[PDB]
């Protein structure tokens, strides 16, 4: 049966450079599991993404809908969305700047959110300078 345990095994089989699995609560209405992995090259990312989808198709039920590999044309970021799981395949330098790990663990307390300041309307609706 296709599960999270099956997913992590497949990535390790394909020699994923780094594996991160985060179990987001049902309060955040996206997924059961958010998975971010690192790849050595674009070709390596493609290989991993295609293999897991091929393995999924074999193991999936007939009622289970087909999945789409997203960001094929992109050389740095690939993502596959399943029913209960989201897989992100990205290059190490891409992962560092986006820091998706930080965002999902800390929803409103992320460092990059802190630097963002909300826009302010000037009082009396009159601009200055």
């Amino acid at each position: 049966k296709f599960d999270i345990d099956m997913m992590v095994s497949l990535l390790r089989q394909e020699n994923a450079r780094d594996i991160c699995v985060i179990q987001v609560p049902p309060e955040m209405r996206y997924t059961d599991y958010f998975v971010i992995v690192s790849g050595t090259s674009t070709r390596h990312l493609h290989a991993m993404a295609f293999y897991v989808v091929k393995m999924y198709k074999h193991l999936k039920c007939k009622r289970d809908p087909h999945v789409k590999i997203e960001g094929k044309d992109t050389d740095d970021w690939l993502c596959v969305d399943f029913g209960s799981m989201v897989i992100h395949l990205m290059l190490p330098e891409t992962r560092e700047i986006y820091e998706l790990e930080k965002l999902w663990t800390l929803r409103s307390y992320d460092d990059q959110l802190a630097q963002i300041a909300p826009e302010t309307v000037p009082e009396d609706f009159i601009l200055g300078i």
Binding site: P26, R29, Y30, T31, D32, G83, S84, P118, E119, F125
Partner: protein, 217 residues
């Protein structure tokens, strides 16, 4: 005695039987899901299952601003400002995906429609998402909030100053001049109030609705 707006039909040539059929269906849905008494002024929290997610539960809190539609298709729009962004969602009462409807604060505003909140200051449209419900005593008339909201500059979504809207919940003195007042008053239509063939008497109708409701119970 409070009757839900959707139960009372709009006037027309529709066969009464159609209303009977729709009413019984509404009443079965009400048996499953409790729909509390609420007004347009009232603050509500709607719990819903979303088809886009895998049966995840969504809570949305906001002030009701419009109750419209009749029968099973009846809806209500509730508005809230979430992290700087003003969002309205239009909820169908008898949609089976609606898990729970909770009245956090039960109140009436001066106006039956609160669409002018779109053009009012954001503060009036902003409500705490995690506010605790306030309970009313079993025997008391529903409170009326006599709040007049301050407005943004003149270009508005609708011309609220015009008498057709009949808005009684805006500080028009602050944001408008007497010249603008008289300009608006040119659209008065004083006769319209006294036109007594335009009146829709929902007395006998409501009585028949109540008979059917008590029969269902």
């Amino acid at each position: 005695r409070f009757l839900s707006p959707e139960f009372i039909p709009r006037r027309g040539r529709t066969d009464p039987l159609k209303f009977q059929i729709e009413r019984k269906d509404m009443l079965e849905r009400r048996k499953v899901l409790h729909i509390p008494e609420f007004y347009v002024g009232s603050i509500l929290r709607v719990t819903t299952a979303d088809p886009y997610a895998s049966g995840k539960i969504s809570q949305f809190l906001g002030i009701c601003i419009q109750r419209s539609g009749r029968g099973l298709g009846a809806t209500f729009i509730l508005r809230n400002v979430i992290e700087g962004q003003g969002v309205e969602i239009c909820f169908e009462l008898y949609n089976p995906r609606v898990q729970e409807i909770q009245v956090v604060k039960l109140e009436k505003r001066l106006d039956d429609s609160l669409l002018y909140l779109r053009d009012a200051l954001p503060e009036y449209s902003t409500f705490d998402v995690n506010m605790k419900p306030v309970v009313q005593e079993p025997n008391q008339k529903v409170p009326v909030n006599e709040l007049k909201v301050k407005m943004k500059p003149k270009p508005w979504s609708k011309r609220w100053e015009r008498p057709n809207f009949n808005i009684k919940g805006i500080r028009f003195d602050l944001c408008l001049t007497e010249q603008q007042m008289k300009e608006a008053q040119k659209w008065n239509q004083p006769w319209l109030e006294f036109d007594m063939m335009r009146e829709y008497d929902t007395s006998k109708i409501e009585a028949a609705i109540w008979k059917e409701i008590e029969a269902s119970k």
